[PDB]
Design a binder for this molecule. Structure first.
Ligand SMILES: [Zn+2]
Length: 273
DNA sequence: GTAGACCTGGAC
DNA sequence: GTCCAGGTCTAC
């Protein structure tokens, strides 16, 4: 889940939990709990607190309780769902928050990569993992200038740059490949080689892509669904991600896949230079 | 930068 | 069996 997916989950989850008071927190895979490290402290501190809100920062969900904020990262397979505490759990459910009304928030994560951090609301933003995150793409804080500042200072690929949550928060493998395609820039070239024109163009495609993806409820390419278990539809608007071997939508040249910054990378060798 | 981690299930 | 994954983190 990247920004669009996490945002869609946020919108569809919030009304299902706002106003509910945590009665118990059960953890079946402690490793998911990063702070406090002692999972029993993590569980105990939240009991009695009420969910007042649900925000998003980058790819992180931010549950606003009374005193604390629960920072949750879905990683590759983390998913949430709300259901009756009287029904048997689904497979790979590693954390469950039980509310006083009998309903519960269930966190499922097949690969167990997701993480959870709990801090007082005031400390959450000045501690990891939120501390060093870059600006929000759909906000004025993210501009061509900010991209240039970081671009014209490193030799690494422009793709590694865009995947760096400290540069800008929210872009992942899918949206980085789509933005570079739409901006007509090869993923493997040095971020420092990008001209002011390309940077301005990339920034514009980044904002447009992430914005459109949000509207379409995110991209369901493998296992992503919103809190209602519903799939997004932006996958129908992908130009290159997962389309290796298929003809480019703009020029018909077969889309190609390689490895860039240690990750599957999709691009059109004609459209992107 | 870039394998190796961390983990599990799904295509071929 | 072998490869792959909407994500970082880390060790050579
Ligand atoms: Zn093309």
């Amino acid at each position: 889940p990247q920004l669009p997916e996490v945002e869609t989950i946020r919108r569809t989850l919030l009304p299902l939990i706002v106003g509910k008071t945590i009665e118990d927190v059960r953890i079946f895979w402690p490793n998911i709990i990063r702070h406090p490290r002692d999972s029993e402290a993590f569980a105990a501190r939240m009991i009695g607190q009420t969910v007042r809100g649900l925000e998003r920062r980058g790819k992180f969900l931010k549950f606003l309780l009374d005193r604390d904020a629960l920072i949750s990262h879905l990683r590759m397979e983390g998913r949430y769902a709300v259901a009756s505490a009287l029904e048997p759990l689904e497979p790979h459910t590693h954390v469950v928050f039980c509310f006083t009304d009998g309903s519960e928030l269930r966190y499922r994560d097949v690969r167990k990569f997701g993480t959870m951090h709990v801090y007082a609301k005031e400390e959450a933003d000045r501690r990891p993992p939120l501390a060093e995150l870059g600006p929000e793409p759909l906000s004025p804080a993210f501009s061509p200038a900010v991209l240039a500042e970081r671009a014209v200072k490193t030799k690494r690929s422009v793709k590694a740059l865009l995947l760096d949550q400290t540069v800008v928060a929210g872009f992942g493998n899918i949206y980085v490949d789509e933005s570079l395609f739409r901006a007509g820039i090869l993923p493997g070239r040095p971020a420092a080689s990008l001209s002011s024109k390309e940077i301005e163009r990339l920034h514009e495609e980044m904002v447009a892509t992430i914005g459109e993806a949000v509207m379409k409820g995110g991209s369901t390419v493998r296992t992503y669904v919103n809190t209602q278990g519903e799939a997004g539809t932006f996958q129908h608007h992908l130009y290159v991600y997962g389309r290796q071997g298929n003809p480019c939508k703009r020029c018909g040249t077969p889309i190609e896949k390689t490895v860039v910054a240690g990750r599957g990378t999709h691009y059109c060798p004609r459209c992107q230079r």
